[PDB]
Design a protein around this ligand. Structure first.
Ligand code: HEM
Ligand SMILES: CC(C)CCC[C@@H](C)[C@H]1CC[C@H]2[C@@H]3CC=C4C[C@@H](OS(=O)(=O)O)CC[C@]4(C)[C@H]3CC[C@]12C
Length: 401
């Protein structure tokens, strides 16, 4: 009943378990909430949707993060400039192109589960949830298998440095990582200008914007956007979502018995986990918006998890239900910047989860104590997730490789 006293840039807010109740207060008492530093946040589903549908008033050019300026990639652009960029990568993400990866992504899933299935235990995050989407986006970007871990670690070091509570060492680590990734990209630019390939990094390297080659800086940021979108998101729905299924074993059981229930489960896994906690918009004019006066140039945080637990929309949002139908979550955002990879992400979730259900049917949490969350203010989900299961046979290994 007391107003939350919070810093929405503090990663701890998103990790310590108190967000859900804080959101509830906001949605009921101050839909457009200003935190203790005065940072405005849209907390109701309707307020998020209203902001999303009016990009003219709620611009993306100011920078998607609350404490950083606009950067040279598509998510920090408004149309038509934004669309110019989407058209450069869209062909790689058509539904047909995504569905043609079923066999490939399936083998990655089977490979990872092969690695642990005979053990009777693994960490669901480290061994399953994190590596699969990394490999998938890596494959699209031409990344070699032995370099996946390097890029994944870089990605982790960038998004974990996103918090007002981290020390100068973490910030330095963030800068050094970005410089390392920059040098990586410069090598790729030189190589793919001379020897273009069919992968997405090569396509971006040789792409054109407004009559000229995409700039070096823009190539760095566009490729990095795709990499992080790929490897710091789906992982949290896989881990956090599977956790909810294991904690609602009736629902786990229904899924093990009927895979036709999996698509509905995936949407609830998405709604619940809401990997992207927020995205910023920049007001282009003074306005009053759902009870709060906003000023031009100020940013507002679109609070997607808060929106995804809006009682007025979902009825019973605090119940995890794989039978939730319809399920109009905004885990992928809405409108202009609606997630490029959302179909890829849904496929990853489907192909991996169906294999887990199938090959590890008696999976369960190793302990029932809290699954720790990453204290970061942007993307966040489970840090680790010990699980146990009856050992089972590999599907690739022992069956002719
Ligand atoms: C569960 C997985 C994912 C979640 C929850 C998620 C969430 C989001 C959200 C909330 C946005 C911003 C939309 C808005 O502001 O309205 C976004 C944008 C974006 N995402 Fe995803 N995403 C996921 C997976 C992916 C994957 C796998 C990729 C790439 C392979 C990707 C690439 C992008 C890109 C490029 C954008 C910018 C789109 C634009 O500005 O047009 N995302 N995502
Ligand atoms: C999840 C997906 C849809 C969005 C992913 C967005 C990522 C790619 C953004 C979020 C936060 C961003 C960083 C914010 C802050 C900085 C500091 C900046 O250093 S500065 O000296 O140029 O200010 C360099 C870019 C960098 C590292 C950004 C890289 C790019 C960055 C990781």
């Amino acid at each position: 009943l007391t107003r939350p006293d919070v810093d929405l840039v503090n990663g701890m807010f998103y990790a310590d378990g108190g967000a859900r109740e804080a959101y509830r207060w906001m949605r009921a008492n101050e839909p457009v909430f200003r935190d203790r530093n005065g940072l405005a946040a849209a907390t109701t589903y309707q307020a998020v949707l209203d902001a999303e549908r009016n990009p003219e008033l709620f611009s993306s050019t100011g920078g998607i993060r609350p404490d950083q300026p606009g950067m040279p990639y598509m998510i920090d652009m408004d149309d038509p400039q934004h669309l110019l960029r989407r058209k450069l990568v869209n062909a790689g993400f058509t539904r047909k192109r995504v569905m043609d990866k079923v066999d490939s992504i399936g083998r990655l899933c089977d490979t990872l589960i092969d690695a642990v299935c005979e053990r009777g235990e693994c960490d669901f995050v480290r061994d399953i949830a994190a590596p699969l989407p990394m490999a998938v986006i890596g494959d699209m970007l031409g990344v070699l298998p032995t370099e996946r871990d390097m890029l994944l670690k870089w990605s982790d070091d960038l998004v974990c440095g996103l918090s007002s509570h981290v020390d100068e060492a973490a910030i330095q680590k963030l800068m050094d990582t970005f410089a390392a990734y920059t040098e990586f990209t410069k090598d790729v630019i030189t190589k793919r200008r001379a020897e273009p390939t069919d992968d997405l990094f090569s396509v971006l390297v040789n792409s054109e914007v407004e009559g000229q080659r995409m700039s070096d800086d823009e190539i760095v940021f566009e490729t990095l956007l795709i990499l992080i979108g790929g490897d710091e998101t789906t992982r949290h729905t896989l881990s956090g979502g599977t956790e909810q299924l294991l904690r609602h074993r009736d629902q786990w059981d229904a899924l093990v018995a009927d895979v036709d229930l999996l698509p509905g489960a995936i949407e609830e896994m998405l709604r619940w986990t809401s990997p992207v906690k927020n995205m910023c918009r920049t007001l282009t004019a003074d306005t009053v918006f759902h009870g709060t006066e906003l000023r031009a140039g100020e940013k507002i945080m679109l609070m997607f998890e808060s929106a995804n637990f809006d009682e007025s929309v979902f009825g019973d949002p605090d119940n995890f239900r794989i039978d939730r139908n319809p399920n109009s979550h905004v885990a992928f955002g809405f409108g202009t910047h609606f997630c490029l990879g959302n179909q890829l992400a849904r496929l990853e979730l489907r192909l991996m989860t169906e294999r887990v259900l199938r090959r590890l049917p008696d999976l369960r949490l190793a302990d029932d104590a809290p699954v720790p969350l990453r204290p970061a203010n942007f993307v966040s989900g489970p840090e680790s997730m010990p699980v146990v299961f009856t050992p089972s046979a590999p599907v690739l290994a022992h069956h002719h490789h």
